[model samples]
Target: SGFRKMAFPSGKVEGCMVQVTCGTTTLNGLWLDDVVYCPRHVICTSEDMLNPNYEDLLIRKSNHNFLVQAGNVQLRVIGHSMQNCVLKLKVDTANPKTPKYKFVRIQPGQTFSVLACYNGSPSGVYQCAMRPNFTIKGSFLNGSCGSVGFNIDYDCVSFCYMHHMELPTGVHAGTDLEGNFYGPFVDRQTAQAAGTDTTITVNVLAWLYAAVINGDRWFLNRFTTTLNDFNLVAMKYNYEPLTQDHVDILGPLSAQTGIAVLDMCASLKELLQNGMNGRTILGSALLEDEFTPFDVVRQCSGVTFQ
Candidate 1:
């Protein structure tokens, strides 16, 4: 919503002008000029759209640092450099409020192994490293190889994507119409009048469009298929399932607040299904090959067809 014009580097082009659009607003465009000199303009906030602190930290395929096994719930430190240093492990949960951590010490020439799951304990010298009897006589740096100072890899985890929104410097929370706390709502025009950039919230449909255009097949497919099936049943029975609204609300919250979408979806879905909501027509059976679509609709909606 805020406006700041930026120019692109001078360059020569061969094909048609490059154009980029966000909804009705064009963030950048390319046009033909002498010697194919194409310049582009972009309207953006003072803050960068890309997440700065965000990083996909993992041991790349080429770098042989750690071995992950057992459905990615276990990690094995190479045995060659296992003695001398203690290992510190930090396990970050999906929640930001708190992260769990564990410490392990490796004995000389001992192979170290650890399980990330809640059901088991770490193996090797780490098992007794925390005990008082375990004495460290040599420097732990070389022995700590692959134990500490290595980034926690996410190979076992699924796909993930994120974006960052800049917050206004002087913004504060305000109350809403229902006497609920809400805020930091910044207006572009108002912010510009004070020679400042106003903060703007994310546009969900816009984000979805970006995901679609950028070819996020897994996320898009899962979301689109789930929503379509949920809504299809609603349309057939003339029932407003409210799943659409639930996702619409959850999507923004999860994106803005750094909340995991899977957790949000699971909790919200459970609440919707278990709450005092009157009734829900079952439709999973209709997905079977033996069931007719019309028959399923009639059975769920109580509407008979000739």
Candidate 2:
């Protein structure tokens, strides 16, 4: 990892001694590469200042602009090799109202930019902040090898939660005598919820974590083809009941990408069945009245029970 140190300003003190920690040796597994700070240091005035705890603001860098829904605020890191050495960019601002002031950490060579939803499409600004530069210990393995990137785009379709009950109940797909896909179903909901609403509803459907894909070096080059193919497959069979072949193909495909499809699909089915089919969840929750603490009271009489 690279080495860097930064300072945070005391803009608004919701608490005391705000600080951001980025670029440690431990962030190698997932998408998050590093963290950001609010107040650059621990400036506690009391004895508690000796041991200070600060909030972590995550950051990342990228060249591409991410399409994200508004209000999906999150921590971001943006940097690039060519622009990695510079402290700021023309498209960024340092005023807390500006995105730059909100950010605690910045890569050495990267610029700053914010995309706002404008008239036709989204618009972006290239600016710089007034903050000083900090050194960070980047990548434990690939030091200075990974390319720079921008903030984490939160509005993408992949990150967005999907609707749980867009389709109707009792929908089944079968092979027709005419050698085509056939289905028997009832009237279903026209539109499914989106964003957080979708996540909530989808959770109710089956409620388990499963991946349909496995993570590996394979298909690294076929990124576009893989994504488009999977999207088409999902759209094609969404209403049609998945056949044995469908399950088989998807199961292994997901396994290769460390994805679990069965549990996810089952959960989706459960949500629809429970809501639209008027079906009730099985098993008793009567619980012999209420959740009471287990206790045994003894009386003078040995055989007497309270």
Candidate 3:
């Protein structure tokens, strides 16, 4: 439903996907929703689809035979099934607790590309799957078909494009504990300019350790403050306060990652507060005092990322 209207060689077309050739590059139709156009773009299609007479353009109806390719921080989807296939991408399989996913509809003989956060975990093994739809009859296509896995050293890292940087194109960068920097570049040019070792991969746990050893408590303030404040608010309203176990779960992630990981906990706090406010009666605190920000920082220390 979110696909755009484009004229194909087969006649006036209104389908989930369409193939276009602007000059030498063959571009596929983009999803109507969540679509962005590049100033100068290119897509390559085979000669059989084109040529003098658009030979195999139409009358090639088939089912889903999908192929998946994984890059450092990108995914390539090629549909051979001549039928429509719903593609599902699971970005972070190692840590299923925090969900990150994307879905797209791929048509036959077309290629679709999308960006993903690489190195989001210790092992960001992207799981790509495709299910046939409507007239498309077949089982799902997944890793067994050619899905690639990304294994980087950093716990929370990705190949991303930052508007703040001069080279706004894709580059490898990672979140720091202070949430002030994106560094430990894997690219040779970027690493050389930034004066960081290209040979070493950035690890979130080691970064935390360095922060602690250097007494850079300010660097860890964001996490400590957010969790502590959240727990305090939850406790004040008789909601279940965040426990040590909850804080420990954040050790594997950077401040940015921790924020994402704790989003659910924060949402729960809001839900609890909303539900508790509906009643007239209220309960007392379990203890005389609440866990402070310092207490949270201390509790989070022992949880290792490795």
Candidate 4:
């Protein structure tokens, strides 16, 4: 709403054109916030280039990092946000040796730095080390938004795919119960195992999504307190050790289902780009097969088809 010029399709971001290691080619695209919406292929060679279909690259900015398990094909994205940004970290490179499938992963130490307004901790330097401790240590770089605050919305995203059928299979938390969250209990050997490992594993937040819609207050409370007060920060999976910020970023999601997206970037982009409102999403596909789609209008009461 603020930048209608930016909020429209005719509107383009005038910042810097980010150089992305898109698929195989090195190309440039705009920073529509944090996502790099670039052409489907390299070099915007045509005048109609702006009309060219595009694919997005996740330039994670501030929060956390993920591990694309060795040879795993699914897009398993998990991380936390301290302010509004995630981390400007990019998808480093796809190892040339493994061009058999053209699959890629963030190169080991292709690093970049950003000075952010960290929530609870001091404004420190975080790197996209593409390693376990990506958020290495340093100064409270640029900006004087020097106030430490908690805009902690953490995310764990993947696809709903067939897991929609298994319904209610993961961790169903009871009030005050100690916990762990899980998802998409499907078992597959992979599509020939040569390539096509795009099956995203659902992460901890799916339970919270279901809990809110299914009205499981206990489940919701357990996650809220456990995550806030406990050591779940050093998450056994892709999540890193930034605990407090994790909680804040995840707080605003009446977000989505089907394909799990847990960031403000997407939430705003969905509405911003299309100029569509709630009515456009009417009868949203398979409301029956799918457990629910969050409706903020319900005050996060969330809708359940059953």
Per-model TM-score, in order, reads 0.14, 0.16, 0.19, 0.19
Off by over 4 Å in 3: 1-147, 151-168, 171-206, 210-246, 251-306
Give the Å shift of residue 211 in candidate 2.
17
Worst 10 residues of 1 by lDDT: 156-165
Is 2 or 3 the stronger prediction by TM-score? 3
- Which 10 successive residues of model 4 have the least lDDT summed? 1-10
lDDT of each: 0.22, 0.21, 0.25, 0.23
Each candidate's root-mean-square deviation in Å?
Answer: 27.0, 25.4, 21.6, 21.9
Residues 1-306, candidate 3, lDDT per residue (tens digit)? 111111112101111122222344332322112221110112213543233122133223111111111222222222221111112212211221221222222321111111222111111122211111101111212111111111111242121111111122222222111112233322112322333111100112222333334343322322323667776766565444455554565444436344433443443344335542332211222111222222223334542223
Candidate 2 regions exceeding 4 Å error are 1-206, 209-260, 273-306
lDDT of 2 by residue, 23-103 (tens): 231111001113211111111223433443322111232322211111233233343221111111112212232122112
Alpha-carbon deviation at 39 in model 3, angstroms: 22
User: What local lDDT score does residue 31 receive in model 2, on the 0 to 100 scale?
Assistant: 19
How would you encode candidate 1's per-residue C-alpha lDDT over 153-237 as one tens digit per residue? 1221110100011123321211111112112322122341112221111122222222223332222222222555544543443
Please report the candidate that would top lDDT against the real structure.
3
Q: Quote the lDDT for 234 in model 4.
A: 26
Cα lDDT tens digits for candidate 4, 185-283: 221111211111111112123223444344433212111223322333223322333334433434545344322233322322232234333332222
The alpha-carbon lDDT assigned to residue 261 of candidate 1 equals: 42
Model 1, backbone clash pairs (residues 3+ apart or across chains), number: 1
- Report the candidate with higher TM-score, 1 versus 3: 3
